Every structure is written in C-alpha cells, then in structure tokens.
Symmetry: C3
Amino acid sequence: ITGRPEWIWLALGTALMGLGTLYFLVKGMGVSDPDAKKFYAITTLVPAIAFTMYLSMLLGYGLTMVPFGGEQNPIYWARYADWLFTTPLLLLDLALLVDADQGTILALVGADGIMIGTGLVGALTKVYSYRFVWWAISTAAMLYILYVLFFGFTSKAESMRPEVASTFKVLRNVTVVLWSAYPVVWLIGSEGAGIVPLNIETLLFMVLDVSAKVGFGLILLRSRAIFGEAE
Amino acid sequence: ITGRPEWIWLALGTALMGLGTLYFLVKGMGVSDPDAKKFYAITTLVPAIAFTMYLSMLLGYGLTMVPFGGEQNPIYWARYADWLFTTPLLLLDLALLVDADQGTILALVGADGIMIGTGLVGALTKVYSYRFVWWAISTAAMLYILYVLFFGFTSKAESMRPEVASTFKVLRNVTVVLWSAYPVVWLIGSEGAGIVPLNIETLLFMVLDVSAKVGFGLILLRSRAIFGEAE
Amino acid sequence: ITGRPEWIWLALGTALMGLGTLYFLVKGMGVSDPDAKKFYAITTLVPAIAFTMYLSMLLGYGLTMVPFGGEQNPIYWARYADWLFTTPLLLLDLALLVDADQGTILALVGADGIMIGTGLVGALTKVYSYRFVWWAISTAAMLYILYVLFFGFTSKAESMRPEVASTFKVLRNVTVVLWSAYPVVWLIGSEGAGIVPLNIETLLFMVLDVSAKVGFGLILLRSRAIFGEAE
Ligand SMILES: CC(C)CCC[C@@H](C)CCC[C@@H](C)CCC[C@@H](C)CCOC[C@@H](CO)OCC[C@H](C)CCC[C@H](C)CCC[C@H](C)CCCC(C)C
Ligand SMILES: CC(C)CCC[C@@H](C)CCC[C@@H](C)CCC[C@@H](C)CCOC[C@@H](CO)OCC[C@H](C)CCC[C@H](C)CCC[C@H](C)CCCC(C)C
Ligand SMILES: CC(C)CCC[C@@H](C)CCC[C@@H](C)CCC[C@@H](C)CCOC[C@@H](CO)OCC[C@H](C)CCC[C@H](C)CCC[C@H](C)CCCC(C)C
Ligand SMILES: *C/C=C(C)/C=C/C=C(C)/C=C/C1=C(C)CCCC1(C)C
Ligand SMILES: *C/C=C(C)/C=C/C=C(C)/C=C/C1=C(C)CCCC1(C)C
Ligand SMILES: *C/C=C(C)/C=C/C=C(C)/C=C/C1=C(C)CCCC1(C)C
Ligand SMILES: CCCCCCCCCCCCCCC
Ligand SMILES: CCCCCCCCCCCCCCC
Ligand SMILES: CCCCCCCCCCCCCCC
Ligand SMILES: CCCCCCCCCCCCCC
Ligand SMILES: CCCCCCCCCCCCCC
Ligand SMILES: CCCCCCCCCCCCCC
Ligand SMILES: CCCCCCCCCCCCC
Ligand SMILES: CCCCCCCCCCCCC
Ligand SMILES: CCCCCCCCCCCCC
Ligand SMILES: CCCCCCCCCCC
Ligand SMILES: CCCCCCCCCCC
Ligand SMILES: CCCCCCCCCCC
Ligand SMILES: CCCCCCCCCCC
Ligand SMILES: CCCCCCCCCC
Ligand SMILES: CCCCCCCCCC
Ligand SMILES: CCCCCCCCCC
Ligand SMILES: CCCCCCCCC
Ligand SMILES: CCCCCCCCC
Ligand SMILES: CCCCCCCCC
Ligand SMILES: CCCCCCCC
Ligand SMILES: CCCCCCCC
Ligand SMILES: CCCCCCCC
Ligand SMILES: CCCCCCCC
Ligand SMILES: CCCCCCCC
Ligand SMILES: CCCCCCCC
Ligand SMILES: CCCCCCCC
Ligand SMILES: CCCCCCCC
Ligand SMILES: CCCCCCCC
C-alpha cells in the first residue's frame, strides 16, 4: 500500500468519509419527520459509497494501468464508480429541496450519467488525442447541469419557503464552484496532459470530494429546510 | 478509424444522433408545462446516450474481439450499453402516455433489462451453440414486452384523451415493427449465423436506431398528447 | 458442463427458478387490482433474473478464475449480478407491504447496494487477507438492513391492516433467517476460508436462493395483503 506516494491522501480520504458517514448516521437517529428522513438517507449514503471506493483505491483494487503516450499510466477507475452513484444523489438533494418537477430531475440525472460515463470512457481510452474528445463531451454535460441549477432551480427556490431558498442558494453556490474544479484537475492531471503529478492530483480530488460530500452534507443537515413546516 | 469498412455507417449514425439530440434540446427550450417537460427530458436523453455510444464505436472503444467458430469475431459491445438505458426510456415514453400503473411499468422495464442483458451475454458467449440459447431467452422477453404493449396498453389508451389514444397507437405500431427487426438482424449478422457481413449489419442497425429514436421522437414531440389538458 | 461437480446444483437451481418464474407469471394473469399488480411484477421478476444467472453459471459464462492463496480459485461472479438486482426487489416487496416512507426505502436499497457491491469486490480481491475486510463491511451493511426491518418496519406494520401485519411478520422472519446464512456460507466456502468445498457451497446457495425467492414469493402471492381493501 505504502509503495504508492499518493497512499497518504487515499488513507486520509477513507478516514474522513468513514467519519462523515458515522456522524450523519448518528445524527439522523433522532429523526421521524418523513421529509427529513429523505434528506438524511440521501446524504448519509453519499459518503458511505465514497468510503468504500476510497478504500478500494487504498488497497489497490480500484486502480488499473492504461497504455497511452507510450507509457503504462496508473488510472484510478474507482472514482467513476463512486461518482456514478454519488453525483446523482447530490443532485437529488438539491432537486428535492426546491420540489423540482419530475422531468427536470430526469434531465439532471441523465445528463449527470452522461457526464460520468463519458469521463470514464475518456479515462480508459488508449488513443491519447481521443481522451480529450470525451473530456469535452463530459464537460458539455456538466455545463448543462450547471445551467439548470441556475436558470431552472434558483427561480424555483424563490417561490418556496425562505429557509429552503436560502439553504438552496448556499448549496447551489458550493456545488457550482466545487464541481467545476473536477474537469480542470482531470485535464492537467495524470488522466489528461500530465502536468500535475498523480500524488498532487490525488490530494486535490480528496479535498474536493470531502468538501463536496461531507462539507455539503454538514450545511444541508443543519438546516431547518429539510423539515416539513410543522407546528 | 477508416480501417473498418463499417466506419461510414458509424459516422453517419453519430451525426444523426447528434443532430437529433440538438434539435430536441432546442425544441424543448420553450416548454413550461410539467407533463411536456417529462416527455422532452426522456425523449432528448435517448439520442444523447445513443450519440455517445455511436461515437465510442466509431473511435474503436466500443468494440471487442470474441473467439467463436475458430475465429476472432468483432463484436460491438457498446450497442448493449446504449440499449440498456435507451430502450427502457423509450418504453417509459409509451407508458407515461397512457398513464400506466406502476406494476406494469416495472414489469416492462424489468423484462426489457432481461432482454438486453441476455442479448449481451449471448453476444459475448464463446461457445457458438450457446449464443442462440441466449438469443431465444432474450426474444422471449421481447415477446412479453410486445404482448403487454398490445393487450395491456392499447385498451388503456382508449379510455384516455383521443389525442393520446391516437398518438399512442401510432408510436406502438412504430415500436413493434422496428423493435422486432433487431433480433432478426442479430441472428443473421456477425453475432449469430454470420450470413450478412458486419458492414451491412451496421447499416441495418443504424437505420433501425435512427428510426426508433429520432423518428419516434419526432412523432411524439409534435403531438399535443404530451401536454396536460389546459385552457 | 458436467466437467464441474457442482453442475448438478446449478442445473437444479436453473430448473427451479425457471419453474417458479412460469408459475408466478401464470398466477398473475388473472389480476387487475393495481396494488396486486405491483407485487406480482416485483415478485415474478426476482426468479426470472435468478433463472438467467443460474443458467449463465451452468453454461460456464458466469465463472471466472481469481488468483489468491497461490491458487487459481473458481469464483462464480454471476451470483452478484443476480443479487444486485434481486435483493433490492425483495426489500421493495417488504417495504411496499408496510407502506414505507421514501427515505427509508432509499436507505434500504442503498445499504443493499453497498452490501452486494462490497461482496463482489471481496470475491474478486487478490490479496487474501483483504477479502475479509470487504466481507466485514458488507456484513455491517447487512446488519443495518436487518436492524431497519425490525426497528423501523415491524412497528410500522402494526398500525396497518391485520392481514398485512401478519404477512409482513412472516416474510420478515423468513428474510432475516435466510439472508443471515449467506455471509456464513461465503466465509467458510471457496470465497473465504475454503473449509467447505465448492460443490457443497453451491448446493447451500441453491437451497437458500430457492427458499428466499420462490419460497418467499409463494407466501407473499397467496396472501390477501397484496390486494387493496375493496368490497
Ligand atoms: C440515464 C443515465 C444512467 C444515462 C447513462 C449515460 C451513459 C449511457 C453514458 C455512457 C455509459 C457507458 C460509457 C458505460 C461504459 C462502461 C464501460 C467503461 C465499462 C468498462 O468496459 C470498457 C472496456 C475496457 O475499457 O471493456 C472491455 C470490453 C468488455 C467486453 C466490455 C463488455 C461489458 C460492457 C461494459 C457491458 C455494458 C454494461 C453497461 C455499460 C453498464 C453501465 C456501467 C456504468 C459505468 C454506466
Ligand atoms: C430490473 C432489471 C434491471 C433487471 C436486469 C436484468 C439482468 C439481470 C439481465 C442479466 C444482466 C447480466 C447479464 C449483466 C452481465 C454483465 C456482463 C456481461 C458484463 C461483462 O462481464 C462478462 C465477462 C466477460 O464476458 O466478464 C469477465 C469476468 C469479470 C470478472 C466479471 C466481474 C464483474 C461483473 C460483471 C459484475 C456484475 C455487475 C452487474 C452485472 C452490472 C450489470 C451491468 C448491466 C449490463 C446489466
Ligand atoms: C445506490 C446504490 C446503488 C449504491 C451502490 C453501492 C456501490 C457503490 C457499492 C460498490 C459498487 C462497486 C464496488 C462496483 C464495482 C464493480 C466492479 C467489481 C466491476 C468489475 O471490475 C473490477 C476489476 C476487476 O476485478 O475491473 C478491472 C478494471 C476495469 C478497467 C474496470 C473499469 C470499469 C469499471 C467497473 C466501471 C465502474 C462502473 C460501475 C462500478 C458500475 C456498477 C456495477 C455494479 C456492480 C454496482
Ligand atoms: C463527490 C464527487 C463529486 C461531486 C464529483 C464530481 C465530478 C465531476 C463534476 C466530474 C466532471 C468531469 C468532467 C466534467 C469532464 C472530465 C472528467 C470528469 C469526470 C472529471
Ligand atoms: C434504440 C435502440 C433500440 C430500440 C433497440 C432495440 C433492440 C432490441 C429490441 C433487441 C432485441 C434483441 C433480441 C430480442 C434477441 C437478440 C439480441 C437483441 C438484443 C438484438
Ligand atoms: C436471492 C438472493 C439473496 C436473497 C441473497 C442474499 C445475499 C446476501 C444477504 C449476501 C450477503 C453477503 C454478506 C453480508 C457479506 C459476504 C458476502 C455476501 C455478499 C454473501
Ligand atoms: C482548480 C485547481 C487546479 C490548480 C492546481 C494547482 C496545483 C499546484 C501544485 C503545483 C504543481 C506541481 C508541479 C510540480 C510537480
Ligand atoms: C429485417 C431485415 C433483415 C433482412 C436484411 C436483408 C439484407 C440484404 C442484404 C444482402 C445480403 C448480403 C449478402 C451478400 C454479402
Ligand atoms: C449456515 C450453514 C453453514 C453450515 C454448513 C454446514 C455444511 C456441512 C457439510 C460438511 C462440510 C464438508 C467438509 C468435508 C468436505
Ligand atoms: C447510472 C446510475 C443512475 C442511478 C443513480 C441513483 C440515483 C437515482 C436517483 C433517482 C432520482 C429519481 C428520478 C425520478
Ligand atoms: C438496468 C438499467 C435500468 C434503468 C434504466 C433507466 C430507466 C428507468 C426508468 C424507471 C421507470 C420508473 C419505474 C417506476
Ligand atoms: C444498483 C441497482 C439498484 C437498483 C435495483 C433495482 C431496484 C430499485 C428499486 C427502487 C425502489 C424505489 C425507490 C424510490
Ligand atoms: C453556462 C451555465 C452558467 C453557469 C455555469 C458556469 C460555468 C463554469 C465553467 C466551469 C469550468 C469547466 C471547465
Ligand atoms: C405475442 C404478442 C403479439 C404481438 C407481438 C408480435 C410478435 C412479432 C414477432 C417478432 C419476431 C421476433 C423474432
Ligand atoms: C442488529 C439487528 C438485530 C437483528 C439482526 C440480527 C443479526 C443476525 C446476525 C447475522 C449473522 C451474520 C454474520
Ligand atoms: C493530443 C491533443 C490533441 C488535441 C485534442 C483536443 C480536442 C478537444 C476537443 C474540444 C472540442
Ligand atoms: C450451432 C447451432 C445449434 C442450434 C442451437 C439452437 C438453439 C435455439 C434454442 C431455441 C429454443
Ligand atoms: C488471512 C486472514 C487475516 C485476518 C483478516 C480478518 C479481518 C476481519 C476484519 C473484521 C473487522
Ligand atoms: C454500521 C452498522 C450500523 C448498525 C447499527 C444501526 C445504527 C443505528 C441506525 C439507526 C437508523
Ligand atoms: C473510523 C476510522 C476509519 C478509518 C479507516 C480507514 C483509515 C485507513 C487507515 C490506514
Ligand atoms: C453536429 C455534427 C456532429 C457530427 C459529429 C460526429 C460526426 C463524425 C464525423 C467524422
Ligand atoms: C422448464 C424447465 C426449465 C429447465 C431448463 C434448465 C434445466 C437444465 C437442464 C440441463
Ligand atoms: C465548502 C466548504 C464547506 C464547509 C463545511 C462547514 C460546515 C459547518 C456547518
Ligand atoms: C418510422 C419512421 C418515422 C418517420 C419520422 C418522421 C417524423 C415526421 C413528423
Ligand atoms: C422458507 C420456506 C418457505 C416455504 C414456502 C412454502 C410455500 C407454501 C405456501
Ligand atoms: C462520530 C460519532 C458522532 C457522535 C455524536 C455526535 C452528536 C450527534
Ligand atoms: C452566499 C453563499 C456563498 C457560498 C460560497 C461558498 C464558496 C465555496
Ligand atoms: C461560479 C464560479 C465558478 C468558479 C470555478 C472555479 C474552478 C476552480
Ligand atoms: C439543430 C438546431 C435546430 C434549430 C431550431 C429548429 C426550430 C426549433
Ligand atoms: C396507424 C399507424 C401506422 C404506423 C405504421 C408505421 C410502420 C413503420
Ligand atoms: C406487427 C408486424 C411486425 C413486423 C415484423 C417485421 C420484422 C422485420
Ligand atoms: C407451471 C404452470 C402453472 C400451471 C397453472 C397453475 C395454477 C395457476
Ligand atoms: C411466525 C413466523 C415464523 C416463520 C419462521 C420461518 C423460519 C424459516
Ligand atoms: C433471527 C435468527 C437468525 C438465525 C441466523 C441463522 C444463520 C444460519
């Protein structure tokens, strides 16, 4: 395990996701409100899935070698397995907060699936120049998602409770900033142009992942917006 | 890319799915009705997914070699990745049109999953005679789906709005004819008996795919059946 | 096929799932009640999926070799493909019976996904001692599911119809006993410590699978709890 310099960040990531999972699990024990239960379920599952995939990367299972540029390049494929399930759960948290219509939710989840799926294909593609074609398609799917979060959701939040409108606005802003960093790190890291070494890349993704999951969850689950308006 | 004679049909397929995706995306921009949004979301996602998988076939990612009959046989596995997601979306379009009950929708999607999954296993099976066992099981799942579309849905459409009944009937008929061709092409093509060469097989699937997705979508999204009855 | 001593149990399993599938399919033909249709759909799909995966194991497709302990160890990976889809369907049968809230259903299905997914990783892991780390995480996800079935569902059933409360209690008890055997068989069988040989392991899983699917389904589909209260 320690044979890879990036192991320290995989281990820290595993620990922080594990701790985040346990914290949300305990916190949600005292919850009976049916609406709050939905948000706790979604939000606890996110770091639990990430915990398993960080562990698989730490132990070496979630790593494969991909030939491109005349080299055997270490590619952590387990990231995409994580993201396939956790990024639509994160979007679902946002969509339920603002009572999004079903068509909009399906558009978001579908675009998200395309985003992660094409990122996976790009990560595993052996023809170097083609990796960036997949990156571009994935990034276009991301831009669609960000567009919807701003010009379909923000003006939906404003007709809702003030506490859900303010909580949505904060989580929207956190999401757009954090999620936009992922394609940049991929592009300059070992999957793309290879300018930033894998150990630093792994650190960067770990900070983004913990912030986008445990950070996000801490903000959401401390808000009164997750509860039905009750006396 | 041009090293494979079937590349021209993969390229045309990619282009037509891409163009179809953009057309539906633009067309749905001016839509606020919650019901119509569902149909636009579902129907736009279908060629978008197909676009990505056609591209993966064009660039060579979605192709693998399978030993059977003492030969290395080129198998485009990306078709099944496409179909796994797009065929239940197509069925969902039909089921929502007639306000199908939840049990029926689950039966359809489940049978569809079995249909595509067993087709994938058959496509990748190395014992030649066993490929046709999987083809038979998949075809039985197809026949179940077609049965339900006729003797569970058609008589559901008739108690609904005339515009939804007439639109459903047309899309049902398009679906049954087009979908029934797929097992025949598989059986006589490079996956099955090998009587029709891969380049012609690829052409045939491209025509079926564009018709079943973009053709289907053009009929559906031009109907007033996708809108709630409103003043 | 007969080259593997466990083939007889794979063949019997295939037959019993096939027969169970046909029986439930015929039985549900005379059903119009929308609630009952949901239970028939879910419950018929379960042995149908299991039938396909038992067949893939019989024909040899669903088997791979995994190096650990200095040996090439036969691992039937198709079990996890089965279980990935059938265990959440089984939980859905239980959850719908007691009209579980959406948050609880998502927690169950999510924990179940983690349970099966980590079992799959453990089954395919090449570092022997690490296989048991994945077994432990999977078992913890199982224990969460069993906890919810007892201390979240049982007291939900009691405020419902007596026929649904009594049917739920029986199916809950069947589920907890049968499902708890699976991690034990894995641990002592060819995936784990290797004390019980593969042919006996295969027998054990076949008895558990038929009981947990066809047995379970026979109890559920003969109950009046699956019908809406109607005059
Ligand atoms: C509604 C939304 C969910 C829409 C989803 C959007 C989605 C369509 C976007 C594209 C997803 C698609 C790229 C998934 C591809 C998975 C694939 C990378 C798995 C690895 O297999 C690739 C090659 C080795 O590089 O296998 C070597 C050759 C092997 C023989 C491969 C044969 C097995 C195939 C992988 C079977 C395909 C199954 C499905 C792709 C399962 C989806 C997995 C998940 C990653 C989407
Ligand atoms: C409700 C509905 C959705 C019901 C669904 C119906 C469904 C059950 C029908 C059968 C689906 C099943 C056949 C999927 C099999 C996928 C498999 C072909 C992927 C390729 O792996 C096959 C071999 C190489 O040929 O791998 C070589 C050996 C490798 C070590 C394989 C180990 C990895 C396994 C593939 C893990 C299994 C994961 C699940 C099958 C994911 C499902 C993918 C999708 C195609 C259904
Ligand atoms: C809401 C709930 C559903 C939550 C779900 C919980 C879930 C997160 C729990 C963990 C699931 C995760 C372990 C699935 C891993 C599948 C993996 C074993 C498939 C086989 O690939 C493993 C190695 C060979 O051993 O591939 C060799 C290297 C290859 C290059 C691998 C590259 C292809 C990757 C497999 C692509 C990943 C796609 C997704 C994992 C699809 C999920 C399949 C299913 C088994 C969950
Ligand atoms: C918890 C994990 C999260 C929130 C991950 C988010 C990841 C993305 C938004 C990834 C986006 C990518 C692209 C837009 C193109 C390049 C490849 C990706 C997959 C890194
Ligand atoms: C957009 C793509 C569509 C609508 C594809 C539909 C495909 C089918 C109905 C495929 C059916 C098959 C069988 C019935 C058995 C042989 C294998 C298949 C998968 C080709
Ligand atoms: C129809 C099949 C059923 C109901 C299978 C149930 C399987 C399980 C509950 C498996 C559990 C496992 C663990 C808890 C850890 C070890 C690995 C598994 C996957 C066997
Ligand atoms: C969105 C953030 C992307 C920028 C990442 C900056 C990383 C700087 C680290 C120094 C680069 C290491 C190069 C020498 C090894
Ligand atoms: C459902 C349509 C299946 C029939 C396809 C007919 C294809 C005819 C093309 C000629 C066959 C090529 C054989 C000589 C290369
Ligand atoms: C939950 C049941 C696990 C116990 C399984 C008992 C199997 C006993 C069979 C005898 C073991 C075979 C060892 C000699 C080959
Ligand atoms: C490819 C995996 C996509 C599914 C991820 C799980 C999250 C799905 C959330 C469903 C949202 C509800 C839509 C109506
Ligand atoms: C194996 C992939 C199956 C899921 C495909 C995505 C479409 C699912 C549509 C869900 C229909 C709603 C059922 C209640
Ligand atoms: C990884 C596969 C998980 C999906 C299995 C299919 C069963 C899903 C049942 C959905 C229950 C409804 C939740 C709201
Ligand atoms: C186009 C929608 C406006 C809100 C999205 C902001 C786009 C940020 C760009 C992210 C950088 C990705 C490379
Ligand atoms: C049995 C349901 C009647 C409607 C379905 C028509 C079946 C068409 C056969 C398709 C050919 C597949 C090989
Ligand atoms: C902790 C919840 C109480 C009900 C679950 C009973 C646990 C049975 C243990 C199963 C054995 C697995 C190794
Ligand atoms: C070796 C790099 C070749 C450049 C490929 C860039 C493609 C980016 C596509 C953006 C439309
Ligand atoms: C080499 C071909 C052997 C014939 C197999 C046909 C099987 C079809 C099954 C239909 C019930
Ligand atoms: C070779 C076996 C080494 C023992 C591993 C047991 C790990 C079990 C983890 C339970 C917390
Ligand atoms: C990680 C295993 C958890 C099993 C005990 C249940 C913890 C309490 C959860 C309350 C919903
Ligand atoms: C509760 C702490 C969980 C941390 C387990 C994984 C950390 C890796 C240590 C090497
Ligand atoms: C908008 C046109 C999209 C076409 C891109 C793929 C066509 C392949 C050209 C070689
Ligand atoms: C209807 C009987 C189904 C049995 C088919 C599979 C049994 C395997 C026989 C070798
Ligand atoms: C993006 C950083 C999130 C910070 C989380 C802090 C949570 C405290 C309530
Ligand atoms: C099956 C062929 C469909 C033809 C689509 C034409 C759409 C015009 C409205
Ligand atoms: C766990 C054993 C189940 C027994 C099923 C018998 C069904 C008869 C109604
Ligand atoms: C990591 C366990 C958290 C302890 C409880 C925190 C207050 C709910
Ligand atoms: C008003 C919300 C500001 C949140 C910005 C957080 C940036 C990481
Ligand atoms: C809305 C601001 C987006 C900031 C992008 C930051 C990418 C590192
Ligand atoms: C391909 C872009 C379509 C242009 C608009 C068509 C009329 C909505
Ligand atoms: C009355 C609907 C006829 C549609 C037939 C289309 C055949 C491709
Ligand atoms: C309902 C008519 C089906 C026609 C099947 C055509 C197959 C090529
Ligand atoms: C296996 C076929 C079952 C025959 C009908 C049983 C009574 C519904
Ligand atoms: C009162 C229900 C008892 C069911 C026990 C079944 C054990 C296999
Ligand atoms: C509730 C009793 C569980 C019995 C476990 C049996 C495991 C073989």
